[PDB]
């Protein structure tokens, strides 16, 4: 119900970020549009996952120096070593994720201020992603100027 939460859907139905509307003459039945051109997003998603590499290049560059002179493989040793290393990696993953998860959701919070500062304080922050606009002092191409839908 607007940016801190994620809902689901069945059968067909696409997924993502869209545009919705609530009440009216008391009481309403809601109405959801079909996404805005929300292109600032896809520029950033493209930015972000292109940054991860920094840490990924870091993890890639670290291979420890070893020397066995022995003719037969040390397989438990090999795989303890491999298990430790995949272990360390799991952590790293978990952090890139949070590093996006936080930074993605920190820029979904750097788009919904663009929306709360154009028509303002008409907007009236119902927090983020969601707002309170009265059909009294803001209307129809005042609402195609602001939301972009």
């Amino acid at each position: 119900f607007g940016l801190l939460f994620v809902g689901f859907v069945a059968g067909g139905v696409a997924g993502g970020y869209f545009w919705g509307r609530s009440n009216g003459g008391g009481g309403g039945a809601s109405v959801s549009s079909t996404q805005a051109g929300f292109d600032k997003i896809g520029k950033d998603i493209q930015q972000l996952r292109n940054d991860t590499n920094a840490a990924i290049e870091g993890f890639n560059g670290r291979i420890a120096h070893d020397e066995q002179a022995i003719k037969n493989l040390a397989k438990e040793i090999e795989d303890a070593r491999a298990e430790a290393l995949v272990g360390e990696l799991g952590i790293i993953r978990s952090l890139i994720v949070a590093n996006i998860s936080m930074n993605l959701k920190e820029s979904l919070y750097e788009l919904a201020n663009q929306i709360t500062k154009r028509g303002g304080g008409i907007a009236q922050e119902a927090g983020p992603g969601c707002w309170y606009v009265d059909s009294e002092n803001c209307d129809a191409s005042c609402k195609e100027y602001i939301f972009n839908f």
Binding site: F5, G16, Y17, N23, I56, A69, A74, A82, A98, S101
Partner: protein, 424 residues
């Protein structure tokens, strides 16, 4: 009118937990993958490595680069001569090529030896040169994993007590003899009324050779083999014997019959066994049965200063000529060694015997500025820490680790929705 931006996912959207919230998305890209592996030889450090070689690595050779399996840039890093081998230079059989190998390098490539195969048809009473060959090259590889440098020591300090004695010759050995061992005889010893006096000799494994330092030395303590006492007595008297003690008098090698049985193949007549022991530097003593005497004269000088695992490379002829794999099995039965093997036969570009495509692409790793690991399975660069399969030892360097593909973690991509909180 309350106007939101609702986030929502499908049965095609999957969550991804972070430490600091989680994430939604339909697809993922793996964080890392495996690192390709290349068969053959290569080196992790280009300015500390040395090859010892032969015609196939010789640039002086009147036929280079058709006669060579390496480029020139690489050929400059070898100590080769056309027709040389480490073995021959340990013995210097009559009319062979006698190159004084000496290099210093941590990574060491050995790509020679074919120039003494059975084809060399060296006789000189050789019991089973292919045996001699294997035991030789093993002590070499045994000592070169732990050494930085190596040099042929082409003349050892020696002395005989017997003064009547004279030096050997064989129809079988081109009518002269080995450079090493040295062979001394007594004309007068007559099994049938004379048996002469026991000869003594001594010899010194030096503590250095020119700029090269000797912690350890590879020699041959050579003795004679006879079918039996009766066989021998037709020359000598009682048992045959030939013995090597150190300065303290502890016995290291040799063949004293008076305590162990005879073992000379039937009617083979006299032979020679040339097993290779590793000895410290120092003065070693020799007692022999009166008429004959044998003496070690060369050696291979090594330090204990350290080495990487070595890379021994398959050095046989083409199909037409009689080779052997004595340095393969020597590399196999010895620690820290690494064999390099062709899947096909050798097919030369100048000769039949010189210029193999498979070899050139095998040894092309030698080569690069960016090899980071070097295993018995071949060699890698530093793309990732993993390999699809195990890198087989012996190996050294930043060696990767085989993990199963299903364990390599992944990272979100395509459409991505955050998450945070129980959302309730």
């Amino acid at each position: 009118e309350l106007i939101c931006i609702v986030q929502r996912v499908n049965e095609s959207f999957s969550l991804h937990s972070g430490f600091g919230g989680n994430v939604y998305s339909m697809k993922t890209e793996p964080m890392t993958g495996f690192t390709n592996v290349t068969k053959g030889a290569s080196v992790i450090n280009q300015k500390d490595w040395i090859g010892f070689g032969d015609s196939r690595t010789d640039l002086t050779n009147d036929q280079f680069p058709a006669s060579s399996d390496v480029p020139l840039a690489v050929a400059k890093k070898f100590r080769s001569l056309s027709g040389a081998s480490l073995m021959l230079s340990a013995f210097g059989p009559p009319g062979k090529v006698d190159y004084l190998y000496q290099g210093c390098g941590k990574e060491k490539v050995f790509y020679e030896g074919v120039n003494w195969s059975p084809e060399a048809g060296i006789d000189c009473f050789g019991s089973n040169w292919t045996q001699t060959k294997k035991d030789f090259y093993s002590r070499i590889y045994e000592a070169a994993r732990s050494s930085t440098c190596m040099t042929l020591v082409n003349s050892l300090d020696t002395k005989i007590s017997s003064t009547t004695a004279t030096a050997g010759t064989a129809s079988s050995c081109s009518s002269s003899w080995m450079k090493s061992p040295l062979w001394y005889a007594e004309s007068s010893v007559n099994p049938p009324q004379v048996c002469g006096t026991e000869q003594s000799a001594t010899f010194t494994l030096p503590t250095s050779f020119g700029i090269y330092k000797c912690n350890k030395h590879v020699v041959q303590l050579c003795y004679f083999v006879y079918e039996n006492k009766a066989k021998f007595n037709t020359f000598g008297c009682g048992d045959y014997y030939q013995n090597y003690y150190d300065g303290n008098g502890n016995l290291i090698g040799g063949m004293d019959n008076r305590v162990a049985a005879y073992r000379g193949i039937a009617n083979a007549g006299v032979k020679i066994e040339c097993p290779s022991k590793i000895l410290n530097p120092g003065t070693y003593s020799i007692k022999s049965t009166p008429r004959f005497l044998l003496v070690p004269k060369r050696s291979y000088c090594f330090d204990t200063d350290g080495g990487y695992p070595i890379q021994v490379v398959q050095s046989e002829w083409s199909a037409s000529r009689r080779s052997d794999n004595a340095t393969e099995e020597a590399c196999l039965q010895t620690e820290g060694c690494i064999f390099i093997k062709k899947t096909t036969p050798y097919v030369g570009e100048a000769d039949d015997n010189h210029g193999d495509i498979e070899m050139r692409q095998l040894l092309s790793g030698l080569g690069n500025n960016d090899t980071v690991c070097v295993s018995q399975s071949g060699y890698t660069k530093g793309e990732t820490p993993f390999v699809k399969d195990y890198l087989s030892p012996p190996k050294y360097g930043r060696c990767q680790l085989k993990t199963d593909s299903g364990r390599i973690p992944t990272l979100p991509s395509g459409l991505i929705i955050p998450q945070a909180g129980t959302d309730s």
